[PDB]
Symmetry: C6
Subunit: 207 residues, 6 copies
């Protein structure tokens, strides 16, 4: 493991990419990876047996948990992270494939066309990344009204005869980790807008 | 780890393979791997103790779970993934073996024949991949009428004296992950049809 | 990780080995590895607490489980896999050792003798592999009359005062995975017979 | 794995960095990593079921645990460690990116400017590291009045009808590991002040 | 991973070592590693909660388990394996150190002396390995009269008021795995005697 | 993985280090690593639920366990091992840093001074290692009067109304593993004294 190799892996042999992404976006993406895995290993965990409802009836607790938290925070962040990654992986594959084609041509203008098409691919990939980030932020807003978790809820549903007051397990730390992940996603959003506009302005300067 | 090595590993030193698979199919296959492992680690888990049936009788819960969910979603996707992989692995082995034979010949026309047989092998492998995907989609349709999971079921079987209303653990997220996996499989299906027809059309153009 | 390295590792720098094993047997052996690990991680698991017997008496459940399933399917397949591997590992060690001896001779006819003895070693190793496969198939037949698992059993043994009807946990999926593993083992058996007879016929053709 | 590679990875190809950090800070940071992971694997663990409150009422124990320990020690140290790392990772990315730009220039004064800007980046990164360390120490002081853990607490909150005397699981070892981590963080603080002042004094000596 | 590297790692750049060990002992040692890890992961497991004694009194079960099985089979095999390994590791270190000394001499008869001392070291190491194997076999004989495990035991000790009939969890498979490990250890014993006597006879032939 | 690389990693490119450490201390340190991890995975485990006290009152068992075993054996050995390692890691960092400085000088007597300072660093590091070992042995003596574990204890503390006789889980194997670890630490102590005195005597011989 060396820093040149790690940097190249994060970048992807993309000569069109600017410093902004290459350094800052790679760094904060690694930060997202770290915070995502440590927190899931640490606080949410199974995040089902921790949820406690005062009812002796079997099954009421699970139904009630399901009602109040349809999709978990950590699974949503993991899905967001994979879906964000796929565009960048696609661009890296495109460049790796194109250089291989060039090599096979050598073994047995056009180069300018290759350059231009790669530029367009990179721009569209960054746009898709931005769109995914924004959509996931909107889903977060829709699912949970507020950043802080709710400690006390009332549970009036089948098969629970009376409304039962029911409690969440570890709200305070989930709030902190939620804030961290949300801030990381926002930073990514602004970085991506800045990167796209920078590319367009540089292209205008060239012509 | 470098992008050239990863790209070559995903492709397999197959000069006949087109850009379509090499880039897009590799990317979405990696996506399938990621979504499969994260979700199993996260939501399904043991996926047996989570299932709750209102009966104090021991064994009725397990019998009832077995009746309603013969084969799990995640195990079925994992089996599908392995079985899909085996054709591509076979083709990669074929090419690696043939180059070794060529080298041993060098140490101590035919080349054209090698090329043609490799082309035929690749086409048949892609066809087998398509067939496996379609068969697994059909099995999904047969096993579960609808994409959304059933929350409430009635359980009238031995050794359960009365029909017991019985509940599933985490349906909402299982629905989302089911949709993601199904969409990935469908994308693979269309990609594979397109790749095969592209190869045939290119061969026709050559002659 | 590259395909040439993986292919060489699976083969073992054995110039006498034919295409049959090198490609097909390596592929289906990798398939056996994958199916063995995924299924054990997934369905059998601890495969003891899942077994449920209707008796409140402590210890009767474990005694009864032990009576009906002396050796588990997955442990038996794992043992089979290790024992099958050891011959091939032995042959790989033999070739690696012999090339080292040749190098030390260089540093400080016979070559033909080396070739012949290596050929004989390979043939005997393949024969041993075939024998191990057949023996394990016979043990499977002896232990379990049928491929499908038994859901309901009657348990009349100490310290269980009455015969208790007792249930298996997840039979339907265990049946499917059993079929997959058995088919893989059979394919290996036929491949091995074919490989040995091919070597003998080629030797006859040479002379 | 070799010592030159590990040393370069810890340092980051930063010619401006002094011996102080390169050796001592790398060593004690590795020590922090080791102590953090071993202790979490060992003593804190799930650190929730271990907490015992004398109440048969379900949910009172979790509410009470949450009140007394809002954020765990180990999660706080892990977050501190990630957040401390991010600056150094950023500087390593900056240098790796700049050398790549220089290479692309070669393929197709300024060098002095590159050197100076890298120096400024390193100084600011070390300052940020110091600030993060100090902030986390302050949070430790605020959250817990004393280094030693409290064995006995009184718990008078909803839904617990009477104040219940409630006990912590493993205080003595948590105290020891707390002391170790705190001492490591303090050593880092002093090292960082010394490194920054050394750089400034050396710059003054140069001019 | 390549076969030459694996073979060299197993051997240890020891020119005095004979074919016997280099191939066969390496192979069966790898077999011991595999069988040890798979079985522990699979059957013994925690091997404490599985043990069931018919007593409602808390603590009687653990005391009784401790009385009947002082040291587990799997831990004993693991300790045997580590202790067996240490001699071979020591010899490998000796040769690696001596070649480094020779290189440092080159940078700035005796060679014959180096050869002889290395030969003596190897012989004594093999003798120590044999002794460790024999001692561990004797301990196995002492601890357990027979290879087959005991299903039923009587437990008359404090704090258990009456002698309780108490049962073992999974005896049949433990018997099989015990036989496998014992056979491997015996094979190692004979191999080691043969290797030592072969070295001595070859030395006599030389002189 | 090769023996030269492993040997260099264990040694650390230290030309002043003698054969004694390089071979024997590396070997027995690897032995300490192995015995530490296997035993913790195997016998101690969670080492809390295994402890059984005859009291139905919740919390009395944990309080009593805490009183009798303030710090666990395995955590203490792990801490000892990390703390022992840090000096050697520091020396390795020092040498790696110094060679890098020499290279940067080459790119753009003193050498004798470098040699001498490195010698002094190595001697002081070995002394610190010896001191850490001795301190940890003393702590072992203080915490536990005897090597063998205590099976039966009496527990008279809050909130336990009567003194309860309370039992340890697996004493016999903990005794064996304790003896092994203690013997390893002692061997290290003697080795370290011998190494330091050997260096001093050799220096006297030089002058
Ligand atoms: C500027 C930022 C956003 C770039 C981030 C690029 C990241 C997402 C890229 C760089 C290298 C990639 C990894 C390369 C190799 C593997 C191993 C494979 O078995 C699963 C996917 C995985 C783990 C890839 C996931 C995506 C990845 C981590
Ligand atoms: C275009 C797409 C479908 C190509 C996908 C090819 C994938 C399935 C190939 C590429 C490299 C292959 C892997 C190469 C090495 C190993 C390690 C071995 O111990 C198990 C199998 C495993 C993990 C292989 C599984 C199949 C694999 C992942
Ligand atoms: C044609 C088919 C049957 C060939 C199959 C050969 C397989 C069984 C060989 C090829 C490489 C071998 C592996 C090489 C390295 C290791 C690592 C070691 O720590 C345990 C054994 C293990 C994992 C070997 C097991 C056997 C192995 C997997
Ligand atoms: C002087 C001290 C403070 C320098 C410490 C630098 C440390 C924090 C740097 C050096 C190399 C870096 C690692 C390089 C590679 C990876 C793998 C990646 O998948 C996650 C991050 C991770 C694990 C990095 C985390 C930060 C790291 C460990
Ligand atoms: C002929 C037979 C008996 C030779 C057997 C030699 C075996 C025991 C040797 C060969 C290479 C050695 C391994 C080399 C590297 C490591 C990694 C280290 O972190 C722990 C020890 C461990 C795992 C060694 C244990 C001993 C080992 C496995
Ligand atoms: C003669 C004896 C005492 C020498 C022992 C030196 C040992 C302690 C040295 C040699 C190589 C070192 C390892 C090198 C790399 C890593 C990976 C890192 O992520 C954590 C620390 C760790 C695991 C180091 C711990 C200390 C280490 C194991």
């Amino acid at each position: 493991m060396n820093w040149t190799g790690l940097y190249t892996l994060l970048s992807g042999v993309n000569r069109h990419s600017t410093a902004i992404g290459r350094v800052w976006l790679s760094v904060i993406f690694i930060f997202r990876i770290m915070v995502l895995v440590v927190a899931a290993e640490s606080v949410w965990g199974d995040e089902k047996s921790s949820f406690i409802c005062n009812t002796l009836q079997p099954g009421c607790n699970s139904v009630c948990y399901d009602q109040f938290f349809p999709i978990s925070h950590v699974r949503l962040w993991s899905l967001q992270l994979i879906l964000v990654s796929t565009p960048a992986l696609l661009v890296a594959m495109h460049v790796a494939h194109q250089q291989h084609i060039e090599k096979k041509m050598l073994r047995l203008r056009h180069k300018v066309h290759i350059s231009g098409t790669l530029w367009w691919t990179y721009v569209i990939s960054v746009v898709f990344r931005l769109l995914f980030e924004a959509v996931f932020m909107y889903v977060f807003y829709l699912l949970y009204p507020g950043y802080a978790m709710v400690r006390l809820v009332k549970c009036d549903v089948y098969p629970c005869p009376n409304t039962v007051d029911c409690f969440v397990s570890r709200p305070t730390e989930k709030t902190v980790f939620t804030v961290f992940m949300l801030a990381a996603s926002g930073i990514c959003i602004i970085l991506n807008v800045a990167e796209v506009v920078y590319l367009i302005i540089r292209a205008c300067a060239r012509r």
